[model samples]
Target: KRKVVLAEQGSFYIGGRTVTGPGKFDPSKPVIRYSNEGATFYINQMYVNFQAPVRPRGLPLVFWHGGGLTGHIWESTPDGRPGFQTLFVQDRHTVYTIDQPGRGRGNIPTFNGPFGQLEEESIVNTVTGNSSKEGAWVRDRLGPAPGQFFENSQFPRGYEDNYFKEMGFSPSISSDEIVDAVVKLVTHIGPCVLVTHAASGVLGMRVATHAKNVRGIVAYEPATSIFPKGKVPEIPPLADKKSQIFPPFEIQESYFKKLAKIPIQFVFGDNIPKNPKSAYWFLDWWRVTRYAHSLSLEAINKLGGQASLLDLPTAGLRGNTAFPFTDRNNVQVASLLSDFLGKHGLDQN
Candidate 1:
């Protein structure tokens, strides 16, 4: 039998408050003492990774899932097939997956307001390519029909139910917290590659400021938008007030100077357009993300950094939804990523 190692698993709580209140809610029974408890408002995160007997490859791979999702992205697909976590391990690589603060196992306290919810229609339609008979739910124009599914879509049609079950929502907090938590993770792990998807994309860039150990970043459909120095008009709130903030992201010259030394890959799947449609939610995000990637690539290149915006379709792979790691063509998709990392000299065994 092959040796299996449960490399590491642990949790860290880094920020909180002390809560003191009445011991009991009884006016008649006068409380003897006040209740004093630790109410940590700090970020909480959990990590887990595995290794096999085989000689390991390059640095450990860190997978950060998108918003409304957790480290589940690295687990088995909704269809119950081996996911990136397994694939990487099989390839003699150690994989580190995390539950970002306020999501999944990282659940922690919030200040006051309530968090948001995930839109069922938009998520199912855009991420899974499941749409409504009416055009109301269409995000990307992948099919000609009102709810026509992509013929080449690799998402497991029968397993969409399971997929939805794994969906998560973003927490109510400032972007700064997200950035800080990510930087902490990268620092603790030391030099490693960051693999982020969707909402985690912005954090990927921001964390680079202090992620002295981060060697590279691989973003999949990252939700990034680096705007000009000036304030830009905000769009009407889509999902929530936070969703409509203009100048989606910001970047400083100094940060770019640091990022320039690292390799970055902004990877997009099929059905993306040079100019994304405004009507659909997916396209709208795609438009902003693509633009941000462009701006980043341009800036990084100017600063002597290596960065590229890649279209998987151009790689002879097509018909992928927003989540490609769980699609039917996952192995093919994985190959492309492995090749990219290898080209950057990350292929060690």
Candidate 2:
């Protein structure tokens, strides 16, 4: 850790308005100041923490965490092992970890009602795969409970308490607002590779469309729907039988042409479609993401863009859950990413 440099760190507020509270009088025997009165305030903050080795290589990398998680995703794993941040640093790459609006230090102190919490069982089933009755992959050698884990499970079991404690909910933010915040960050930071997980993946793609500085995008199992052109859309929790039913994401052909010039990779974990007994939510999302990425890739390529899908299992990583960055085999995943960047000339020293 001492071998790395702090480099830079700061925060900025975005996508919020100032509100002036009613003025109040001071009771002390002194002149009243404007501080005594209610003042204009803003919410929706964007924070960044950057680090690098004394000697650095390649382009800067911006790490975007998924929904219900903070920038902590890139930090040390639950079991205290080095995380992607350290891996990137040791590889001589500058890393910028972000806490998007309404998460971690970016959260507003006064906001409450709009936020939603995920159920514990939902987290366990989706992230840990522990509740799978069909039996999950278990490590034959390191199991505290043999046969209880998914085979080749990369998630650390030794420090689950820490993981649960760090997991937090996302505040209700509109799609437009999310895109705005991310675009602002990209613009502020200049050109860089956008590395995103889960929910932030779609935002990364959208931001790339708007921010010219976004050199490339690595979307890991983005939680977005890919609707066919002019297709019927169905709302969730209810089926629309008339046509293909999900919100349509329309990207202009011009943007696709620009996107064709940039490199993009859609990475999926091994256990996504493997565990039949896993929760329906996971299965449904897997199906949607696959379809969406296919549509997106076809469109981009048709317009001369470059994009491809990768399954971690095929790449020698198996049974990883959603949060692969914090898993035990995260270093392997990091190496894979470094190689991907190198191939794109984004990892040059």
Candidate 3:
């Protein structure tokens, strides 16, 4: 049997930061699960490396994985294979995966044990469902439903305490904190390409809203909310937005209007129905749509700009992934993305 069976995916570690400028910093190591498996969370190293694309002039990309998973959620290799590192190497582009605080190696900084059961039980009672429990909203909103892992990760607990207080995240504990961390990571790598899956797609958009050097955005079933027919709220600017407008509703009418200058695209599979029984949502998926309207079009129209939309529901399922690096869907979406980026102004040498 192989040493790494069942793979116990994700659980990256902080190897060392990559510095491209006086303050530019990104990880320069592999964030793998120790050989195979271990604790709930551990920061490993970044898997893929950078190989600056040929034209060397495309939108730099910072890819975000789906929830309950780490940066590993993206498809680095192909078809359950490990040649992704090679594929990217051949393409001549710089790509990286990240661990949101609650999921990957980022988990360490976000979670800490209660010492033992005495503390653990108290910790559970003190933290679980206590929306006002300071710094634990992430856990509360997205944590365990019944008996998953330790109460749906603990990034919320730590986020409010660390990131939120410091304003590492948006004024409220918005998903943008992960975006903030990613932007800091990508800016150092050079201008970037933002790629995200499922819910993070919306987060990617939120991050793009605050970024000054973003070149493009590719969202795989990117997270979005359905503006009830006539009740759809106008997307608001990252600033002046209220905290209560997340989860059930996250579209910013303000940002929606400005989406043209930037290149934005959304893709999902057809076979991947909006139903609940689907594998992706089998556990828990953030199904927020009825879009009946095109998301890319909505953004572009609002901004008087142009973007694209893709359907890869089958790809979504085959890959068993909702965002980040998808399977052939990657090829489908990336091919169009490559074209869009090249035509816009991001084509490599």
Off by over 4 Å in 3: 1-57, 75-79, 82-86, 110-176, 226-256, 272-296, 313-333
On lDDT, the candidate that comes out on top is 2
Q: 1 or 3: which has the higher TM-score?
A: 1
TM-score of predicted structure 1:
0.76
Arrange candidates by lDDT, descending: 2, 1, 3
lDDT of each: 0.64, 0.66, 0.44
True lDDT of residue 59, candidate 3: 49
* Model 1 lDDT tens row, 239-331: 322444234665665665777898889888777655534455555555555665677677777777898888888988888777878777888
Report the C-alpha lDDT of model 2 over 1-349, residue by residue, as the tens digit. 4245545544445454344445654557455442424444455557777886666677889999887678887888878877788788778788888888767877442411222212211111122212221211221112223335565778797665676666665645456666787788777777799999877887787788789889888877676643234532433331222333245476655554667779998887755543222233434445555665667777677666788888888898886766777787887888788878999998875
lDDT of 3 at 95: 53
Show model 2 residue runs off by greater than 4 Å.
1-16, 22-37, 109-148, 226-248, 274-281
lDDT of 3 by residue, 107-225 (tens): 22222333211212321122322123232222222222322223212222222332222212211123544555665665566677676766576666666666656768767665564
